[PDB]
Each structure stands twice: as C-alpha cells, then as structure tokens.
Curated annotation (Swiss-Prot), chain A:
Component of the ribosome, a large ribonucleoprotein complex responsible for the synthesis of proteins in the cell. The small ribosomal subunit (SSU) binds messenger RNAs (mRNAs) and translates the encoded message by selecting cognate aminoacyl-transfer RNA (tRNA) molecules. The large subunit (LSU) contains the ribosomal catalytic site termed the peptidyl transferase center (PTC), which catalyzes the formation of peptide bonds, thereby polymerizing the amino acids delivered by tRNAs into a polypeptide chain. It comes from Saccharomyces cerevisiae (strain ATCC 204508 / S288c). Belongs to the universal ribosomal protein uS17 family. There is a cross-link at residues 14, 45, 55-56, 78, 95, 104, 132, 140 (Glycyl lysine isopeptide (Lys-Gly) (interchain with G-Cter in ubiquitin)). There are 2 genes for uS17 in yeast. Its main location: cytoplasm. This is Small ribosomal subunit protein uS17A. Pfam families: Ribosomal_S17, Ribosomal_S17_N. GO terms for cellular component: 90S preribosome; cytosol; cytosolic small ribosomal subunit.
Swiss-Prot record, chain B:
One of its GO terms (cellular component) is cytosolic small ribosomal subunit. Pfam families: 40S_S4_C, KOW, Ribosomal_S4e, RS4NT, S4. It is found in: Cytoplasm. Signal peptide: none annotated. PROSITE patterns: RIBOSOMAL_S4E, S4. This is Small ribosomal subunit protein eS4A. SUPFAM superfamilies: Alpha-L RNA-binding motif. The gene is RPS4A.
From Swiss-Prot, chain C:
The chain holds residues 2 to 125 of 197 of the full protein. The keyword Magnesium does not apply. Keywords: Cytoplasm, Isopeptide bond, Nucleus, Phosphoprotein, Ribonucleoprotein, Ribosomal protein, Ribosome biogenesis, RNA-binding, rRNA processing, rRNA-binding, Ubl conjugation. GO terms for biological process: maturation of SSU-rRNA from tricistronic rRNA transcript (SSU-rRNA, 5.8S rRNA, LSU-rRNA); ribosomal small subunit biogenesis; translation. This is Small ribosomal subunit protein uS4A. It is found in: Cytoplasm; Nucleus, Nucleolus. Component of the ribosome, a large ribonucleoprotein complex responsible for the synthesis of proteins in the cell. The small ribosomal subunit (SSU) binds messenger RNAs (mRNAs) and translates the encoded message by selecting cognate aminoacyl-transfer RNA (tRNA) molecules. The large subunit (LSU) contains the ribosomal catalytic site termed the peptidyl transferase center (PTC), which catalyzes the formation of peptide bonds, thereby polymerizing the amino acids delivered by tRNAs into a polypeptide chain. It comes from Saccharomyces cerevisiae (strain ATCC 204508 / S288c). One of its GO terms (molecular function) is structural constituent of ribosome. The lineage of its organism: Eukaryota, Fungi, Dikarya, Ascomycota, Saccharomycotina. Belongs to the universal ribosomal protein uS4 family. The keyword Ribosomal protein applies. Present with 106000 molecules/cell in log phase SD medium. Its main location: cytoplasm. One of its GO terms (cellular component) is cytoplasm.
Curated annotation (Swiss-Prot), chain D:
Component of the ribosome, a large ribonucleoprotein complex responsible for the synthesis of proteins in the cell. The small ribosomal subunit (SSU) binds messenger RNAs (mRNAs) and translates the encoded message by selecting cognate aminoacyl-transfer RNA (tRNA) molecules. The large subunit (LSU) contains the ribosomal catalytic site termed the peptidyl transferase center (PTC), which catalyzes the formation of peptide bonds, thereby polymerizing the amino acids delivered by tRNAs into a polypeptide chain. It comes from the Eukaryota. Component of the small ribosomal subunit (SSU). Mature yeast ribosomes consist of a small (40S) and a large (60S) subunit. The 40S small subunit contains 1 molecule of ribosomal RNA (18S rRNA) and 33 different proteins (encoded by 57 genes). The large 60S subunit contains 3 rRNA molecules (25S, 5.8S and 5S rRNA) and 46 different proteins (encoded by 81 genes). Pfam families: Ribosomal_S8e. This is Small ribosomal subunit protein eS8A. The lineage of its organism: Eukaryota, Fungi, Dikarya, Ascomycota, Saccharomycotina. InterPro entries: Ribosomal_eS8, Ribosomal_eS8_CS, Ribosomal_protein_eS8_euk, Ribosomal_Se8/biogenesis_NSA2. The modification Phosphoserine is found at residues 65, 68, 72, 85, 142-143, 146, 149. The modification Phosphothreonine is found at residues 61, 106. GO terms for cellular component: 90S preribosome; cytosol; cytosolic small ribosomal subunit. It comes from Saccharomyces cerevisiae (strain ATCC 204508 / S288c). Signal peptide: none annotated.
Amino acid sequence: STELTVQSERAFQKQPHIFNNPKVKTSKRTKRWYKNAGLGFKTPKTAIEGSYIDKKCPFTGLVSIRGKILTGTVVSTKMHRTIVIRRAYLHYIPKYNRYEKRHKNVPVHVSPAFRVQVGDIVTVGQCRPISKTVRFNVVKVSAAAG
Amino acid sequence: ARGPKKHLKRLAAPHHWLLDKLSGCYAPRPSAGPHKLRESLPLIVFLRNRLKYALNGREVKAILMQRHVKVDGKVRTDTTYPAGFMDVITLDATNENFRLVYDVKGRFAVHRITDEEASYKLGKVKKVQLGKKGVPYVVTHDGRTIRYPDPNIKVNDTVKIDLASGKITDFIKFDAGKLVYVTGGRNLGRIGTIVHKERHDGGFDLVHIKDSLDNTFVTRLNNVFVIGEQGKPYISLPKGKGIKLSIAEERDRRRAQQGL
Amino acid sequence: PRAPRTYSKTYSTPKRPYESSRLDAELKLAGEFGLKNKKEIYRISFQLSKIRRAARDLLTRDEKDPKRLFEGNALIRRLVRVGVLSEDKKKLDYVLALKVEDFLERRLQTQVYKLGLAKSVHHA
Amino acid sequence: GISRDSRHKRSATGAKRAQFRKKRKFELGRQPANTKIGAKRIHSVRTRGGNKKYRALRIETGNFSWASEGISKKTRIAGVVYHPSNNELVRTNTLTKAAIVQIDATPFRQWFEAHYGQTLGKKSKNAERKWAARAASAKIESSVESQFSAGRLYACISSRPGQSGRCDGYILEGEELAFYLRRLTAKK
RNA sequence: UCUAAGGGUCGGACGAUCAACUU
RNA sequence: CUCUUAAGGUAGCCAAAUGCCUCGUCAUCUAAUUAGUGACGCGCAUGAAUGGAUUAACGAGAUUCCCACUGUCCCUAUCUA
RNA sequence: UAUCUGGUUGAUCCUGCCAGUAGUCAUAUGCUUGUCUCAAAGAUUAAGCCAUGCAUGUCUAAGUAUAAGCAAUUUAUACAGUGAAACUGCGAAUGGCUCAUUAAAUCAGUUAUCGUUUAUUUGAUAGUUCCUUUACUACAUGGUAUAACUGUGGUAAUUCUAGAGCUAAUACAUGCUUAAAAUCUCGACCCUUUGGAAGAGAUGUAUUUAUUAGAUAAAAAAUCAAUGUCUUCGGACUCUUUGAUGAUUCAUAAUAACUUUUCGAAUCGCAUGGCCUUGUGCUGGCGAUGGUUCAUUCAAAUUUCUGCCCUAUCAACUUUCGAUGGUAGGAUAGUGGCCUACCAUGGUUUCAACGGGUAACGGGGAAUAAGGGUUCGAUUCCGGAGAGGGAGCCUGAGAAACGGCUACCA
RNA sequence: GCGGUAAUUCCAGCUCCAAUAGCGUAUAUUAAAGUUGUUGCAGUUAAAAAGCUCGUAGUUGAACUUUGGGCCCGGUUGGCCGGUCGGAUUUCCAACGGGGCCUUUCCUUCUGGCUAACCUUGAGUCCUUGUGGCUCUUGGCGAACCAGGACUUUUACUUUGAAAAAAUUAGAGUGUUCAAAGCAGGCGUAUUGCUCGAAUAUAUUAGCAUGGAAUAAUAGAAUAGGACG
RNA sequence: ACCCACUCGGCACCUUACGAGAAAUCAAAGUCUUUGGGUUCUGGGGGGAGUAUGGUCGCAAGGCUGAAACUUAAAGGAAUUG
RNA sequence: GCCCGUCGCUAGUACCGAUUGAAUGGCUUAGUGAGGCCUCAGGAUCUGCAGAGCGGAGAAUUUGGACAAACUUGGUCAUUUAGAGGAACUAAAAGUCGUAACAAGGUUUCCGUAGGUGAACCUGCGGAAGGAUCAUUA
C-alpha cells in the first residue's frame, strides 16, 4: 500500500531500549537500530536511513529469521504491512505417472523498507508466528517488468 | 500424555543393542544421564547380553549393590544408566578396563584396554559459552561442563579430560587431515580423514571423509568426532578400524580365516 | 503386545484343480517316492517358484552387479551343499532349468532306500 | 477454564473446526488483574513448573528511571492521564503496561539539588569541587523543568504488574515526551 | 456521570474561532 | 347387440353456496362431532364467456381448528359516577 | 507366478454380461478330527450396563521411635537391635484397555524455537546473610503445634469422624556465622595548588526496571567537553581488552534503583585420628540427604513444508459474539485475536473451498502376486483421543487425571 | 439345466473321483477383469461424438544460439603371453567409459590471508667429460582454500549421497533334529578357555547437499535509463 | 468462351487393399498388443427409466441435470442356410 | 411363426398423498442457570509487637467477572416412519378386447412436435433410411 507517517497511531511507536539522550547533542536525530539477518541477505539502505518502525521487519525489528526460506509470487497487496504470496507447485501421481498443478497461498508480513506490488517475485523466510496465519517475512524482492 | 514416560517397549529399543524380539514386552528404558538413550548403552545391556557375566537383572543389581563398577572412575549403581561414547568402564575385582565405542557395524564394541587409558578419555566440545560472573565454560557430548578452558578451543573440537579431576589437558582442533570417528548414520563406526568440509549456512554443514583405503563418504557434522592425527589416534582402537569392508570381503575373510 | 511370532506357509495350490496330466504326474511321483499327499509336492514347487523368482530378479541385472554376484554364489553353493544340483552346472541359468525331482531325490525318504536299508520307500 | 488455543478459533477459510480434544491445562488462560492504586495488595500465583507469578492489585511507590541522569528512584504514584488501548483505564486510574501516569517530583528534586547543588526551575570545599565538576551537566530541558514547579511529573510504564507484581517505569524525556505532550494538550 | 464520531467561518500538513442536534 | 336423438355432457370439478336420498361412504381433526377438511362419484338436477378449473395478494364477506387471552362460564362477589 | 472355460443362436463370428476357478492374517458357520511345534481371541452389534474379588504403593547404616510391640542379649541414663502404626519424602500423570470422536483435524516424513517450561539424572556453581560497626544479637544450635498413642464418645450405615490429654522431624516456622583486597560514593579538615586528604558508608546471589559496553573493513590529521599514567613539566601517550552465532537488544559484565526479599545447610549414618597453651580445647576422613543458577538428559508445548476417502441433488463461504490484518494492552511458560480496546476490510475457492457423508482414528504395515494396480489397516510398534456424557478444578515438575475431587444429565 | 415310468444329474445302495486332519457353505475382497483400461478398452451399425459454432480456466504448443577438430592424463574390464609356489604384474593389443588442456572459448570478482610451486638465483657442489641431483634465502605464480563485500536469472528433470525407528518384506550365515521359527552358535586341554557372529538391501512422494546442463519453459539490450572502463 | 497441359483448394466418385475390422464395410473406420502427435465429450449387461425426487430455465407445453428399490440370463450386433 | 397395448384376478417394489403425521440426534437463538476458579468484602475463631493500640493466622458467609454444566421453548437440518385415496412398474401358465410391429406385415418404417381416440394407436407439419429406390447426359 504505502508507508505511514510514523506516529500516526495512538501510541508512540518506537524502538524499545534504544535511547537517544537529549542532553547529548548530535547531527543525527534518532539512534536507529538495525541488523543483518544473515544468509548473505543484504540489508537495504532504507532500513537504516528510513524512519519507519515495523518491529516485525527482520531488519530494525525483533523477529529473527531462521527455519525455511521460500520464494513466491505476490497476489494481494491490500492489508497493512502484510501481503499474500502464491506458491505454485506440482504433485506427482504414480498411477498415471504424471503431475498436476497445485498451489498454496502464504500470508506474510512485509517491511516498509521494501515497496512492492503484484508480481515482484519474492524471497521470504520463517519468522516465529506473528499473527495467527503469518509465519513468514519478506527478505528480498525482485522487479517484474522494467 | 499427562507426563513423561517410565516404560519402554521392546521392538522400539535401538537395533544395535541386539536384543531378541522375544523374552519380554519391555526393555530397560535408560535413565536420564550424559547420553541420549538411543545413542547410549545401559549397564544391564553391557553385562547381561554382551559380557554374559550375569543372567538376570536381579544378578546385575546384586553386582551393582556390590559396587563392583565405576564410570569414569566414579561408582554408579543404576541399572538403566546411559553409558555411551568415550566412557571408561573398569572393573577391579577382575582388573579389566574397557572403553565404549561402536563397531564398524555401529554396534557398541567390546574394546578392552589397560589400566592406563582408563586413566584418560576424550570429550567433543559441543559448545563453549560465557557463563556468568564473566566465567567461561565448555560442555561435552557426555553432558559434562568445564570451567576456565583454553581460549583457542572452539566448537566441534575434542579435548583430553584427565578423568576424575576434570582437568582438561592437551587437545585437538577441528581442521583438515585430522583423524575422525563417526557417530551416526550408515557411516557409524567408520574412520577416516577430514578431506574437505562443505559449509552450508542455514543448517547441517557436511564433511567429506576418506578412510585409509581411499574409500570416500560424506556425513553431517554433528556425527563427527575428531580423535587424533592421521596414523596417530590418541587411544587404542577396536578391531576392524572402522574401515567398512564389503559383504563380499566379509564372507571371503570369514571362509578363508576359518579353517586350520 | 509381545513380539509377534513370524510364520508362513510352505506351499501353494494350483489355479486349475482338475487337470489329468498334472494329477497323473503328481501321483506318479507319489508312487515313485513314497509320499503322503499333494501338500509336499506343492511345497517343493513353491520353494522352486520362489527360487526362480529370485533367479529372474538377479539375472535382470548386469553381470558384475555385486548383489547378483554375492547372492547367486551363495544360493548356488547352498543348492550344491544340499546336492540337488550337480557339481558342474554352477550357473544362474541351470538353476532355472532345475526342477522338483532334483529336490526330491535328496529326500531322506529317497536316499535311504537308494542306499538299501529299506527294500521299499514305504519300508523306509 | 479459559483457553488460549486456536482450535476454538475458526479457520483461515472462515471454516469451523471440530472439538478435537477437551480443554487442557497446558493451554490455559487466566483472568486479568485490573491493578488499581492503593495499599500494597499482591497475590502470588503458581504457574507452570511451580514457577511463580505475582498479581499486583493496589500500588504506590513505583520504581522509575530517569534516563538522562541515568538514575532510578521510588516515587509516590500520583494518577493517570492517558492510555492508548482504552480510555477507561484513565477513567478508573487502572494500571497496565503503557499506562501513562503522574508521580511525585520531590525525590528527583532533592537528588538534583544534592548532586548538582542547584535548584529546580525557580561550602564543604570537597562538596564544592563536586558541584563545580558536575556543573555544565547541571542543565536540563525547560519543559521537564516545568513540572518540577508543579511537583508532579509524567512517566510511562515498562512492566506488566499483573505479572511481576511490581509497578516500574520511567520518567518521560525527549520527543516521545513531546508526542505525549501534544496528546496532553490535545486530549486534556 | 462520562467517552467517541459526525460541522461552519477565517487565516497558510496545520492554527484560530462559533454553534449545533444526532448515533 | 339394440331403439333413439340436432347433439347425446367432452375437458374438467363435487354431497362444494349446486346432491333429494343425506347425518351419503372412507380417512382425519375430537374422549365423544348432523361441523370442517381431504379422498370417492350413475352427478335428484355439476360443467365450460348463461363461462369451467386453479389463482399469489386484498376483504368491517361466510365457516372450521389451533396458540395466547380473558368473569363467556363453573359462580358469583365488590367499588365508583 | 503373464493361462481360462459353460450359457443367447437352427448353426457361425462379435460385443457384453451371468456362472464357474484360485487365494485371503477375513469373519461366521456346518461335518470331521490321532499326534509334534507355535498362538489369535467380545473390534465388527451396544465408548451398552455391570454383581463379586483383584489391579499402587514405597526404607535404607543413613528423616521422625518411649508401640504402655518383640527379642533378649549387653559399654552406653539421652537413644543406639528389630520394627507395627503415624508423620515426612517420592510415586500414584507411567503402564494397561478401547477406537467412539476427529476429513489437513490427527498421523507420516522434514524443519524451527534468536518464541517456550522442564521434577529427575549427570557435570558445574555460593567466603559477603547482622549491625550507626565498645559496653549487642542463642551458634555448643534458637520456637510451637500435631499425628501416631491414651481416654472420652456419636452414627443403622462408609476408608465418617468430634472433644480432651501427651510427643518428634531433613515436617512447619525462625535465625547468626567468615579473609583480605581493591572500586565507588560521602567527607573532617588545609590552601590554594597542578589541588590532598584522614575517616563514614556501599559493593554475594535472585526479582523488576532504565541505561551503557558487548569492538574490529584499510590507513593518516585538527578541534573541543572532560579526565587517567609517565614527566627528561616543553609535553607526549608507546606496548594498549575483547566471546560466539548465518544473524540478535545473544552470552555476560557494569552503573542507579526496586522487592510483603529467593538462596547462601540449626539435617542424617559410619568411622575415628591428630595437635597442645590439658581444655574434655583446637583440628580432622568417609558418604547420605537436601539447595540457588547454568548446562545435559528425560521430556513437554507450539511450529515450517508436502501428503488425506466419497460428494456439486453442496458454489460460494467467512465477519452475532474475530471473520482477515494492523497498533497498544492483558493473559500464557511462552509467540499468536489467545483475549481485550481502537482502527482497516480484508481472508479461502472449479488447482473444488464451504457444507454434507464416512458402517474413518492415522501411520508403519496385511491380502492379492508378471508388471503397473486394487482392496484393507479396531488389532502385538509409533503418535493421538477417551474413560457413562458434558463442564470445572486442587495437588504436583507434570493431569483438565478419572483405578483424583466438585457440580449438572442418564 | 436333470425329473411327465424303464432319471448317466433326485432318493438311496454298489462302484468310482479330488483333497485329506482336514473338507465344505455363506458373505466381503483380490487376480481372473484389456468387464474401469497411465501402461491398457470402446464410441458408423452391438452402450456410447454434445445440433452447430465462439470462448476463459485446464491440457498441449514449429524451428533456431559451441559444433567439430587436435593434445595429454590415467583407469576396468577382456584378451596375449604367467613371472609364480589356483591368484600374481609389465609390456603387446584393442573395447569401454572417465578427467584435464589447445583450437577467438570465466575461471563470479575482490580485499588479504598462504603461499606450493619457480620465471627465480645466491653460493657450487655428491657424482659418469654434465642440467643426471638436492638442502639452500633476497627482486619474482595464485588458487592449494581459508573469510568478509558483491552477485550470479530462475525453475523443472536426472545422477549420487546423507538424513532417514524398530518390527514386517526380500535377503545373508547357522542341523530349531527338518520345517515354521529363532539369532544363535561352533571349536580345545570339555580340571580352570578359543572364537565367529547377530549381515545387507528395499526403505519413494515432500525437504536437504552435491554433479550433469540435453530436453520444456523463464530473464536479458529497443524511447538503449544498455554494457563494460 | 471452347481445347490440351499443370497446380491450389472444394463437393463427391471408381477400382483394389497393402492394412483395418465381428462382419457388413472402410483412403479412412488405415498407419493398434510392434499397444503413446495434442485435445474435449460420452459409454460399462438388459430392464425399471430418461421414470421418481430435488434444483434450475420456461407464460405454458416442456427443456437441462438425473437416481433408487425391484427384476432378469440374456437382450443385442453383423452375417450364413432354410 | 413372432408379437403388442388397454381391461381383469393375485403378490410385491418404490412414488405422490390431506394428515401442521410420528421419531432419534446434532447444531442453535432467546430465557433460566448449577458448580468450582479469581475478585471486592466479611470476620466464628487463635495471636504477635488494668490495658493500650496497632499487626498477623483466619472457617462460615458475601460482592463482582469469566469459564459453563444442565434445563425450557422455538427453529433447523440429517436419518428412519404411519396414512385413506391415487398413480406406475414388475411378475406370474394353460383370462377378456382387438392385431399395432417384423415380409411392401398388408395405411413402408422410425424421430421430434401438437391434437384426438377403448386399446394397442390414427392424423397433421417437418426431417431420416435403420426402405420397398445406390439408376434416365438420352
């Protein structure tokens, strides 16, 4: 969808335990915390130079990516900070010795360090259930057409 | 099921203990201890079924009540005690000394040793970790923990405990060309070198192995146990040297050896 | 809940029960070898069909296939140690040409009366 | 009794699952503690493993951190102003995490006037060597210095007193403070 | 006894101001 | 098979407001039913724009049953102008 | 071990079926029946009901002995053997039975817990506990309150129990001990410096909170805030600490606070020795049980991905009351709409959802045998669920227990 | 389909037949059944091509882009001798694949860590008139693989492997007396111990790691916003 | 325009049949047990029955979808002689 | 020869069918609401630090919330199930009516559609050949 204006919500969304002592003067306005998630996944600039919060982003957040890493195409970009990915695949029947087309949809969380849409073939990784369906978080994203 | 389990069924025990299907519903269900039960060995298994010294667990219990046994030089009286790899077992009423290790067929082996070499052992470092008060510590595969280690030690290496004082001494790192025992899978019991490590960040890095016969095979890393330098094990090895003959070589050796 | 006791049966019936030639030959061997009923014949044929199954299984494979080599040699030396087979037919093809009368000659019932001591299979 | 399970819940496809097993204690839930403000009333609780939880109910004397000064005091808890989840919590002056309040100022006052030797928005040559050394770090934000005149200071919670039994938090500073200040003049 | 939501007017993402009834 | 009509009542519908016999027969609703309904039909004397059959909806139209309600009643009493 | 045959016709060739055949670890039944070995067995219908009886209790040298028990036999006037009963501790949550439920529910295989608790085992681990710090505070050791027992008794009746009177603990509840060290605050004063300083106090662990470190990807300069060592008093600063993971706010340490303050041994059996300043002085072994935290084990819960039979005369479902998601909180051991406020309108589907049916627990596996398949799998192993049905619940590490309790129904 | 008076089928008797301590019956199921058909049915007339056409999903979907040549490497079978006291290796021989080079032919690249190998050579010698031969650091090899940055278009398929509970299945060895079975057991001095064992395979579909790069798809650079530098 | 010749695509025809088929017959009904170019639909003994019920569409007739119990050893196809 | 439908007797299968037909089980609204859990309270009874106060141990009872058994009524689906009367089918050996079809079956046959008729069926419109014509360039 978009990115908010950070403190749009009733509560001061911030990075916990990240203190920026106003007695100390500085050219930076906020101590930003971020990280690499590893597996060679490249942390984007936007995490580090941005002001968005998204605790559930693997960058600048408190989830920890580990487990499986999937890829898939994007089909729904509606909800706030979460999407749905379609995983197409095949299923082998020995009786006829053939395949057929099956698929499964994967609701995931997405960071507002990415900015995505339909298409946009995805890298996504397992992240310790988030809300009731969402077990996966975006890690990297591809372009579609150009 | 409302709690843990106090009873095991035969036909579920590890295949390498070599129990008959008959003679019971139930097997010892090894106690909690250093070693995980499927990777371990009970004392009753060691004595009754392998060394034949006793005939019933009744007698075996009587033996332990006599305190004839120690483990790592420590008297231990439990029937179901989970012994396992690199332990020490010694008996003084017969002055026999053993060391627990698998066959090339992955079965815990009758490997007798001297009174010395029941004076030391090995321990694979499963991890190092910074215990509180700033104090570091190390752990093993046999559940032991150690304070104040050699800083150069890191994970997956091995170490020479003394036995009884703890007291780590000279050790060996994980690095190429070293000598290794296998602790899992089809390759369990085998021996060979390190020839290459295959890294895979995310899980289950692999190690290629070459035996003395240039037979080559790969395993997971958690089933590794470095044991010394090539042509220089730090201990006394069992028969066969974890070298994995074929079935043809097996029967050939059997028929040729047997006779005269 | 103990270990189940393995078991099996040692024979198999025919598909076609009323066949003149089959009945006649079975009875011929019965009279020849001093037998009790068809179960024994069927049992020999059952073992034989097992063996020929194994034979086809091995011989499907390449020669030099270690499985076929090991198992064929072991099977062969078994069959010869029991003596059903001659000393020089020691190949996976001749075993297929093998038949039940070869098994039957190595019956104790036979070898006794063969080596005197009975004067009749029935006496034996 | 209560459950936290997701089997009572419908499915992703709006579907309705069956009663697969009866309720189990390892999925239990417990009813809350609408912690009010009063005498120290705390009921201890057996949790799983025999580990203990501590349900506060009526509190004063909260332990609050001052970040810039890096200290931590114990404060006569005053009252409640704002809560994002429900305004009822302010209406009842009921305490949770994220449960903004006012508190006494005098301990922080006397700490400041003790350490820096100064006053709050109005000899012993060793003590003088201390005060002069602490000088020029003895400045603060004007806005936070304001409430000192009033004697009642704004703070937030970091605890779950329905779990810990403790009511602990920290005085506001920075731009979070400015946010909730905009909220103060907006709501009150 | 309270809470929220629902307008106008004037000044440049807002600021000021006035009045309403309705859920 | 006959007499006989201009034609000989077809489609359809019923003891229906049209049927003597009649409280018609059968079933149902009832403890009990000349009631009502549904079926039957040689229908005294049904029947096709003298309109036949059905028909949602509407009816200060006629009728039966049910639920609730109640001095209609068992069974009367009391109070006010 | 790849096999067929009889029936339509007056006869012939096909299609197509009926019947015949063989097997069935798949049941019943009939007839018959000598032996050897081995051995399934109230699943099918009634997760229908049940008489009687049985199925979980437990002690070592080593927790509690005045049995007004026993034996007698021997150092013991505190006991010292054995040992009922009782207290205490542990277990009784395993095991065994059954398959009714359940249709991506379970279950199989494959992950993950940097998102969780963990009795027990094993290995590690605790010098700090009090007090304005000379007229102190049991440390050779501090306190009651109970059974068991005695006797008084009730009830038609149960493993019901009421009063009174004794008495222990590794029960219950209290409460001391201990080295120096440096580090921090506080400070009398003195003497002005470039400032030095007695002496007052704090500094185990746990809990909760805030903050900081937790480096490191390559090599050199200037400044300032402070504040450390060396001064060859102009000054330099040279050796200069850094853990692991693919990855963290991890490990851990530190500062300032917090706590109806967690722990830091008032316990038990064997032995019995050495040291004098001869007190019954001081030292002193073996092991048994406890205990904080960590690790390990035992597990446990959640959890990734793929996989379920029939049904379209089931095509839209989902959101009252979470239906999908977000933010915050609460609860959980813990993530999570798990629940609550508030907000958004999303979420699934002809690749078959939803609904229905299942005479459905899943699986490993069984039967049939050219092959590919089909059919089956209550059942000797794993996993799950249940204990007449529903719900709730105490204890404990662990149960929504049922050979445990409460309520409702039959 | 037998029976309506001389029943080859009924009732028995006689005789005879298959199996045999087992045999039959009923029901369910499997093969038979190529009568459910992926392998592997049929569709003019025997059942069955929609009245016809369009059409989304689905299924499928033309060809084409390094081929050829040359060099070396060293194997495992099969021969030709067999040296040898039935198994043995070198040459002679092919066959069969396998690996690495050159032919205009990434080897993902750095930043260093590491160098082993020499273009080295700084001194000459053991020793055949000397490049036969090796210790020996000072200019001068990357790959021999550590580890951080950057990507590599990605899938599908396939090979191999690991990881994969046991029991059951196949299956190895063994006189339970054979056999089902079991995992034993067998050898001396059987008065004073010796020892082998208790295999192996199958274990899929999903997931993981590797090799392969045909086949079938996908991407690129065309408003060059292209590339390398 | 008519004639010859040639080629595309049409309606069909004639002869043989290699081949196919149960046979009639067929240049497709062939290129099929030596069983695979792609793809949709339909059928599984006969009857009951295209009936019942449900749904839907239709003004209505009627259409589309589409059973069951029950019953039965034949029914049927091509072709030969009578 | 074969064969068709109505009618008729008998048996049976299922269908419609007034009867607000009956019955079992779920799921449920609404209502009622047990039970313990936590919670505001309470304070029989014991007690710390002449009596003082504060301060504990504390049962019965009690406020409130959640869980929620169970119950009432209605709805509701899923499965059985009664019913006058009606209307089909099937079957029977030795019934009534006729003779529609197979031959040019004696009106060639059949399909769809509409009407009518005791019955098979007749007729109308439009098709097919599965016909009783592979055929009239002469």
